Symmetry: D2
Subunit: 194 residues, 4 copies
């Protein structure tokens, strides 16, 4: 569905549930009832983010509540990604090639799902670079080599030396950091954020 059509149907839904008519709503917004009716007819495409903010406010709700869901990109409930179409993204922390993100399949039917094959470039734990924790839990699996894992307080953290085949879970907002085992050059792991 388009932003316009989704908005058109949801706006009408919301307007009706708070008992307003085109006239009533048009008044609170300083618009004409025809304008409002136009939106409800799919002509809202050029409304600005700020204007959408006002409409949501007047309807005592959020912009998200008035916009359609992510959408559906599945092929009969499935979506596949070949190994050569994986987007690559160099990760840099403190002007260093820390990670290399090879992005796996993603779908608008589960936006929070972000699976990655991560090349861990550095192999000096003492130079581990912490992220500040992030929303969503994360599942990890060591694909190759040994990983030196660090989590918690970046000043005084807990650590773990993980052999190939190990698997771990990091709750959301828990700060963590990885490097390959001391001197082993590099390691590789699968990270699934969900």
């Amino acid at each position: 569905k388009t932003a316009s059509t989704g908005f058109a149907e949801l706006l009408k839904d919301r307007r009706e549930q708070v008992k307003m008519d085109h006239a009533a709503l048009a008044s609170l917004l300083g618009e004409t009832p025809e304008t409002v009716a136009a939106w409800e007819n799919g002509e809202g495409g050029e409304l600005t983010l700020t204007q959408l903010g006002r409409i949501a406010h007047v309807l005592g709700t959020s912009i998200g509540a008035l916009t359609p869901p992510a959408g559906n990109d599945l092929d009969d409930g499935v979506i596949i990604q070949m190994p050569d179409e994986r987007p690559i993204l160099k990760g840099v922390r403190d002007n260093v090639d820390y990670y290399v993100y090879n992005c796996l399949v993603r779908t608008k039917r589960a936006p929070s799902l972000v699976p990655l094959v991560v090349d861990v470039l550095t192999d000096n734990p003492d130079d581990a670079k912490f992220n500040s924790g992030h929303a969503g839990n994360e599942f990890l699996f060591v694909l190759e080599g040994e990983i030196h894992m660090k989590w918690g307080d970046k000043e005084n953290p807990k650590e773990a030396l993980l052999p190939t085949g190990a698997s771990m879970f990091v709750e959301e907002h828990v700060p963590h950091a990885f490097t390959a085992a001391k001197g082993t050059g590099s390691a590789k792991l699968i990270a699934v954020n969900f």
Copy 2:
């Protein structure tokens, strides 16, 4: 919070969780990395609904996921409405004054909460006008008089004669209709959609 600032922070959050940088994102959108950086700096206010649709799509998520929540209009967790500031809205079904909606307090911290004092104008059950059911459950309480309630199939519905003080619950999407008891003139009830 504004639409612009909320968008700016959420866009950055999302861009980072799918591992893209300004360059990567700017490319999929056919924009310049400076443009994207501008959005992330609160300058997205004039983006159109349709453009927001594209950005969401490229980031494999929804517009709602990139926009801030409804907002907070409470006064230390509370919000009050005096009886004279209630918005009134005449309800018309089949060119008739069916209901009269007196809207009670609402808050952006619970958008689905829509409480109403409803004047039931007609008193001829045989002329009951059905709504087609709606999202969200609804709690009813008969404030004055007797209500003749109808729900289910509008062709062959179930009925109930409700005395003052009665209370009922209607699950979402269950079509219903009300009128005052046969010949009793009018009735009044409290309807709380949540």
Copy 3:
């Protein structure tokens, strides 16, 4: 649905999603595979709360996850309560008849919905008795008289004199207290927790 049958189906579901068979599960619990199979066949009725605790633990989940939902008590999506079948419950704070709760309709399809007609017995604000705030938001409507509302810090609270017909919203965990307006004897309000 029964506790036994719901448990039987959900236990099997969970056992299968963690890839265990009767033997595997029976082992972690110190039971025989036949015992486990019995549970999955509706014979778990006499399992104790503590035993259910162990089963949940071994299956790394909660007891709730292994038990059926509240159930359905609706009559085609609706449930009605006549004014004379309302359960009455005297409310006492500091050995005083503070409130009188007349409980309205409730349903297992929305357990959090607790609507009440509350008789406010005291009319001395200075003797207001605070609750410590509670889970779930609450919608209030003054049915009769004047209410003296208090919320926030019980040591230094905010106040509001509410006329008949006023409506208010109290967010969850916000401590509040009510009495009838100073010297007006008593008042009455509708309180809907959802």
Copy 4:
């Protein structure tokens, strides 16, 4: 927390939100007010599943609502699993060694997370054995060899030959089946249910 203590605190919470006192609740259950008070004091451990069913019913809610959450087994937000402590479970479909499940790390803070390394034993697509779809989405990654994937209608399904390194997503309730590519002997993949 224990089943007993969690129940004790939640029962009290629920009893209070529906305005009942020990006497009122004890009456609907055919128990003594002291009995009820005992439960609220952690002595409910021996209550049977069926009895818990009644208590939930009387309180118009679910057993889950009266029992504590799964619990917390993390070590400062993290939990690790070494490759040799992975529980193994042979998978059999039609009296054949179809799969071999090597279970990875799991946590009570995300019960729906069930990650597995799956050895795909058969390599004859024509003999693919379908599951009937299951709750929860699933992320797959081909670890070794080639997988012949099948999903949808088991009578007339869609197929995909997946090379090592491919990744896929299967929405919940979509029936699927895997085997190694025709004649290639065996394959191995990572399956993450969340």
